Structures are given as C-alpha cells and as structure tokens.
Amino acid sequence: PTCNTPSNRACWSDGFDINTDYEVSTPDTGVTQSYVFNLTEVDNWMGPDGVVKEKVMLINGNIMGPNIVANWGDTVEVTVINNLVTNGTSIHWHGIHQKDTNLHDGANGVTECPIPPKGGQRTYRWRARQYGTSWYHSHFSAQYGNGVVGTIQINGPASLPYDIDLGVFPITDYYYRAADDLVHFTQNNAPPFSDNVLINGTAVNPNTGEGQYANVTLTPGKRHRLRILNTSTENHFQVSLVNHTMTVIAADMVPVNAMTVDSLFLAVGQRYDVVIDASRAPDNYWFNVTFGGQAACGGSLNPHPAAIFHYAGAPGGLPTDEGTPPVDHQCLDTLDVRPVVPRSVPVNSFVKRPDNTLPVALDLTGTPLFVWKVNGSDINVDWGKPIIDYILTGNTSYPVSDNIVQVDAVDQWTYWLIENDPEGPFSLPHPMHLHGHDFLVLGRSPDVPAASQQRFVFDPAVDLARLNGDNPPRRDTTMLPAGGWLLLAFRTDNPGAWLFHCHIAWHVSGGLSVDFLERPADLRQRISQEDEDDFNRVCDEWRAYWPTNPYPKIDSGA
C-alpha cells in the first residue's frame, strides 16, 4: 500500500500493479490478520425488521460475522469455535482460490469433516493471492441461511481511480423460517419468496413499517467505490440507483475493464465492485433491489426493498423520486465484462463428448419430489468420510453419490458443457459456482426470457461461432440459463477436490453438485503434515460426536 493514491489506483507496490498476473505472483508481506468466530445458537432473536425469528446461528452474536480486512499478499487466519447445540460446521471462503491449500476450503464431506458442536474447533489459514471483494459462509447444508455468513475485503489495486472506498455492501434474502425447515419444505415444494431483503444487514418491514433503510453517505463530487455482494440462499437481484450510473471495476474477485451500466444483475454468490460518482444534485436517492426473469430466479414479499443513498450536507429523510423500473435482466449475468489481466483459449476446437458434458436433470420419480441430478446422480457427500480421506489412504473407490469427475490433466485448460434439462418438464436458471478456481465463461445458450421455457441443445453448426475465447468473463459464479446450456473452462493449476454446484441452497441440498477431483496423483504430496493431522483430528472428534446427534441427515450435506 505504497503508491496507491486516489489519482493512481492502478499502482500498489514494487512489481505489483493492476496488470500483474495475480494467479501466479503474490506480495510477500509476512502479515497475518487473525479473527475468532464463535458460532452460537440463539433462539427467539430480534431481527432487523422488528420480526422475531424462531432460531438463528450467529458468529460473535451478530447478524453477520466480522468484516475480514487484509491486503494483497497477507495471510488470513481464523479460529472457528462451534458452540451450536447439534449442528456441525465449516467456513467456506468463496472467492478464495485456496492455492495448494485444498484442506482449508471448508467443503463438508469433501475437504474436511464438520467441526463438532459443544465447543469443537479448527483454525483455517490461507494466503490472499487475490484482491477484491469476496464472502464467507457455512457449508453445513444450508446452515448459512440461519446467519453463519460474512464478508471478505482483500485490499489491492483497481482498474479506475476513486477517492473513497465505502467498503462492503451485502444484499441478502431474509426468511423468518429457519434453513433446515426450508430445506425440508423445498424438497417437496417450489421455493417460496423471501420475507424481506436485507441491505447491509438492515431492511424495513412492508407490513408494520419497523426497522430502518440502509444509509450510505456520499460525499458530493467524489468517486466512491462500492462493493456489492449477493450473500443470499436463493434470491437473485437486480440493483439500480436512481439518477445514477454504476461503473463496474470488478466482477467477483477478478478486476475488469471499466463498464458503465444503469443496472446490475447479481446472482447468488456474485460480487460487483462499482465506482459511483456523486455527480448529481444534493438529495437522497433510492438504491433499488428489483426482480426480473418473471420469478424464475426469486422474488420477495417486500415489494420494494430499498436503501437510501444520502448526499453529505443535503437534507434528511426518505427520497422523493420513486424512479424508473430497470431493464429485465432475465435471470442472466452480463457477459460483456472483460478482465484487466487477459487469458486465451481455442474455442473452435471444442467437441461435445460425454466426459466433458454435465447434464443437470430434475428427477420427479422418487422420494422426495425435488431431487436434482447432475449426470444422472444427485450428490450425497459423506460427513464421516470425506474425499480427502480417500486421497490420504490411497483409496480410489469413490461412491457414485460423491459425483467425482476426475481431471488428470496437468496445468491444461479443460472445457465443460453444462446442459440445463433440455428434455425435462420445465427448467430453472442456476447460479453455477466453482470452488478453487475462476472459470472462463466461453458461452451460453441465446439470451431469451427465463420463464419462456424455450429449449436449446448445443449445436456446433450455429453455436461454435457464438463462443469467445479471446479474454472472456473470468469469475467464480455465473448463470446457467433455463432450458439451455453453458460452456465453461478452467486451467488445472490447483490440485484438489473442488465442488462445482448451484449456489441456490435448496438446489445444492437437493443434489445439484459434482466434485472435480483435480490432479489426485499430485494432491497427496502437496498436503502438509499439519493439515493432515488436523484433518484427522477433526474427523475423529466428529465421528465420535455423530452417534449422539438426535437429528438425521435429510439432504446432500453440501
């Protein structure tokens, strides 16, 4: 943080700027930012909107956990003490690649066993090889829907000059019913609408009027950086600010070229760092959270979830301009974003084959009704025996339920075609997410309305020309369009077991996931004795605790 000034945000330190390939070069700071998480179960907790919730799971007694702040090249260490009654836990660091530190990913039944309750602990330590905005959450089923969530801000350079960094701005769905009850509900029923949408942890109740709108004070004439996150379990958001444009400087944790838009689509898990110029008249302006796609990717019972953007020195109160409804994004993220640091892949060479195809299908023949299958199999990870235990014991007999897609290719690009139930009854859009990598969104089926139920299968005769291998969007989460397909690509530079799943909590609970066992033969040697011992320590403590649990495992575990 030497040469980083408001006028020159492109610079950071010697050898490190916005054009430096962050996936291969990282600043040697030697600084460690430590945090302690205390997961406690609170019954009959008073919510931000005046409504009392039956049960919540909280980190350090707050709605969200600590705002993790570190610099590019720092090491983030977190001790997670589980003081919940029955539930196990883990903390997944979404957007953190976890380069050669696979066992710190937090994916239950994959990279670790769940940390046992009644005082169980584990200390996560990872290097911040990427700068930007990210988030953390539990990976114990849909436990993060109870409140085990928070934000990660790794400071670094930018693709546009700005004066003030307003920090994190998480927008999430809010349900009065607990996550485990909602997983049981969605197994046999269609997903419900949210009761409210929280902006920076606050929202107003549409029935009573209680609570408060989020208040962001803008300094007149200054460029402000705002880090918008979607920490939701199901809801996909469309965000807009009345009489203002937002300039995207980053998509997820990948800095992109300046892209000025009127509105932004945020899928579950997606982040967007924007530059907002306080260029308009001194007044209060509404920041609106709308829903497009015709309820194909969510909705809220709060008809107008909003936040207030207040200009400093201007009068207070509620904004008078209700605004103009934004463009219907049709449950799709923009593929116009072009990364600052480029990547190139041959797209003409692609051929649709079974070992590169991941068909997402909805099975309505079994018990329960909503069972999501990827390649004819719904994922069901083993909390007692993770995929890493198999790696450490030289065991290759992975169960069909673990959905292991073994990628043996070394440091090469791998192409993946994900099909969204073309022959099925109906289709829903899916926020596809990959652990341990930022993928290249090469292409998707034609942008059509989400509830249209229009189908598209990959036809090389029209679609090979629709792909872009010259600096395509690089991110950790993107939309799988309803009724169609999606083409992705990631370079195998990080040996480990990585989940690739839909980020809608109900869908991943239903089974929408695969496990990319990347370079298994290379993985075993890269695991330190410290990580192995600790992996085995937590698994032993969990295997001892499980027979005393009064509740069963109703879902996938992921």
Added chain:
Amino acid sequence: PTCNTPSNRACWSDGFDINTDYEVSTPDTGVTQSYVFNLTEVDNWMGPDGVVKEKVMLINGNIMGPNIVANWGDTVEVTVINNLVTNGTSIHWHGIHQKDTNLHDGANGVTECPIPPKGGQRTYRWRARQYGTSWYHSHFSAQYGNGVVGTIQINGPASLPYDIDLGVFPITDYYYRAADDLVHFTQNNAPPFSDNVLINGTAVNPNTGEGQYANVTLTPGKRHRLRILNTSTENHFQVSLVNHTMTVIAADMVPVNAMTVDSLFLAVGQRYDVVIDASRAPDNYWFNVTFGGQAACGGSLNPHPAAIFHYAGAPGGLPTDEGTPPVDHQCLDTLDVRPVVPRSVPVNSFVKRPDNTLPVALDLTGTPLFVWKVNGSDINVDWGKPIIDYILTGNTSYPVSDNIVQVDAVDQWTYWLIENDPEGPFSLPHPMHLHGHDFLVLGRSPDVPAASQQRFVFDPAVDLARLNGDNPPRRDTTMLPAGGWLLLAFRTDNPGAWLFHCHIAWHVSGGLSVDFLERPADLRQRISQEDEDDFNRVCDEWRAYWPTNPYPKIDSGA
C-alpha cells in the same frame, strides 16, 4: 332501438332499459339473425405477422368468424357445416346463458355429440336474453386454438353515455404450432410463451417487422365505447392506453356501474366494455398488452404487443411515447365492479362441506405428467355418449370421468368453494368459467404475488368477514388465485348439464372441469322434440364416422 341516443344510452325501448332485470325479462322483436359457418382446414396458411402456419381451422376462410351482430331480444341462428378433414366440432356461445336451451350450448360429450366432418351440419338457435359483448369458439378440445373463434355483439343499453361504438376488439395469443401439438406438448411440459399476440386479428413480427399494428381511429372530443375481449388459449392480458384512462361500463355480459381505471386485467374468456374519452392532445397513442403476475398466467415472445390509437386529423406513423409500464395485476381480475341490476345473497350462513367444496389438484404420479383433477378426478367426456343421452334414456349411472356434480336445488342460490391445490408442490392461477350462468364472486384468498407460492385454506374465523353478498361482481369468468380459494354462487334457474372449467385450453384438456347437472328431473321435460331429434341425428352421424377417424382422443374432450 327507439330511445337509444348518444346522450341517453340508459334507455332502449318501452319497458326495457339498463335497470330492468335482463335475466327474467326479454324484448319480443320477432327478428332473427342468420349466419352460416363453413369450417375449412387450411394447410400452409399465411398469417397476419408474415409467418406461414402448418395448419389452421377457419370459419369462412378468415382469421376469425363473422361478427354476429343482433339486438336485445333477437334470435341468433347459426348453421355450422363441418368441412374439416378428421376433426369433429361444435360452437360454444360463451356468455350466452342458453335459458331452457341447454342442447345449443356446444359442449361436446355434454350437450351434444360433435358435428362430423366432410360435410356434417347442425343449426344452433338461441335467444338474445342478454346484451353486451361476448364471443364464440369451438369446444372440440383445443380446436379453437387453430382459429375457430369469433365475436358476439348483442346491442342493448349501457351504464354511461357515449357517441361512437367502435365495436369488438379481440385480443388473443398467437402460436405458430397447431393446437393438438400444443395439447400434446403441455401434457408433459410447461406451457410455452406465445409467438405473438394478435390485436383485432393482426400484429407485427418482432424478428422480421412484417405485418401491421391494429389501427383504431378516435374522433377528437367524442366518447368511444370499446369492447375488449380476451379470446386466448392460455395468455391472460393486462391492457392500458398511453396517456388515457378507461371507464368500464361492462364486465363480461353484465353491465356495471362506471369505474375509471388506468389498466385492466383480462383473464382467458373475459370481456370488458370500456368508454375511452378522446380528451388528450391530437397524436398517435400506444395500446399496450403487458404481462403481470410474473409469468404465472402466461407471456409472449413478442416483448411489446401493441395497437395504435390514431386521433383523426393527427399525423400518421408510429407513436413516439413508449409510456410507463402499468401496475402488476398479479393474475387477478378486479372485484371492484358492481353490476347495475343488483343481487343479494347471505354470506354469513356459509359452511365448508364436502358437497360444496371443489378441490383442484395437479396429479404428477401417472402418465401423462400434467393431469388436472377436480375432487380427485380428471374429466373425460364421451363424444359418443353425451350427458344429455343419459337424461333422455332415463339412465342415472353417470361415469366417474364425467365429473357430475348433481344440484337438485330448485331456483335457489348454490355456493361453491373452489380450492387451488393448497397441499401441492406448486399452484398456478386458474380462469374459472361457468356455462349457462353468470356467477356471483363472493370472495377469494388474500391478493398476493401470483408466483409467491403463498397458500391459503378457508378459515371461517378470518374469511367469513372477507366475503361480500351485497351486489358482488356478476360474470361468467373469474380468477381462482394460485394457492388459494374462490367462493362462487349461482341461482339454479336453468335446468341442464353445464361445464364449469378452467378456460386455459391446456388445463381443461388435462382434466380441469366438473359438470353441473342442474335439475335433472326438470331437464328431460323441457327438451323440445326438435332438439331431441337433432341431438340423436348428430349423434348417429358422429358414431358412424368415428371408427373411420385415423386419430385417437388424447385428452379430456373438453
């Protein structure tokens, strides 16, 4: 028509005006309006938007049939000659009560056997006991989806003065794929969006630009009566005119007290007579067809279906003001409408009993996937042996599949609670329509977002107060809200077999229907020797034709 002038539309003739009970008093004009319907099957037909359709079934070689225009009291006589290749037919007169003329209703497998093809004929004769706007269509499955539709205009008095009667304005969904192929698609798949939406038999293709917008010429300063109809197979419309208000003077074929609105919801089969005042600046204005209810009750591949309303003396071309999007009606018709001629019913005396409760359920366990059941049974009428045949032969052993809800009540109000799959995975909105009557809409479940998946079961403690029995909306079509309930009421004044079904073509084909066999004992004695002979004649000709038909019956028949 004697005293019906632009300043006094309330008057009609001696003893007949807007306040007279049309349901029990009718003018004796002694005049008859005759029409001959020639149903031809046209392959590779050129559509209004430029697209060539595989097959269509048309009356007298046009997009719609002729506009049946008669006065109140006149008798409408129509000879339907069936020159189709394979299909049987009938023409149902929607909105027309058919007072003591049950055998002219056109409901196949209920009131008649289908008129055979290759020259089969039958003459329908019915008295114009009601005035206002209505429509007619085929009742041979979803055959009307191929183009066997048309409008009915029975002139009479109105509830507000106007100068010009612009006539009928039929708005319908338009599909490139034929009806029988769509019934087959919807049996196992979710209904698709319409390819386009025709307004008065015309539209512009959103991809090519071929075709024309509907052009209505408004005269400056004069009050214009517009008769808006929704003749769709699935699509439910929201209609609005840029910079103008619409003053509703009639809901279906029931005249209502003046009600000014900015927008109107029209369910499948709904009509609305509005008065548009040409009180704005001389220009071209857009008439917009929008979709609310977040695609719960339809949508279109044409993002903006519209018509042009040109003021006489103004310049030509397309309207420059795109306008502001209207309010989301959430797939619900307005219940604020109050009929001119009132009706009063006790709503406090209502008790939910199995013999007054009609549960709508979607069965997903059998083959095909989408099978709609009412009270545990999906309707399946017998084209070869109709309900009237059972009445004429003294046979009371009505099949389970005929869904006979026998109402013995003589000239008394009957209350029906229709439930919308409260315990099911998902629930869709249903435009409930009744034959031979105009029902009283006493109440429905609390108005909530259409695809919110909020459920409501009738709870006497909070719902009995929510009902209205003092001049409630009287019409033949209304919305059964998604996940809720609907309380209807009709006076048993017309003995006969009457269909009560969802008007979405695909849903009635799936089985969403019951048959109100009203006053059986009174019915046999009220059937004329001419109607009995015609019925048997058409049934003998159809039963003789059927074994030669190369296609089977894949749906309900309704």
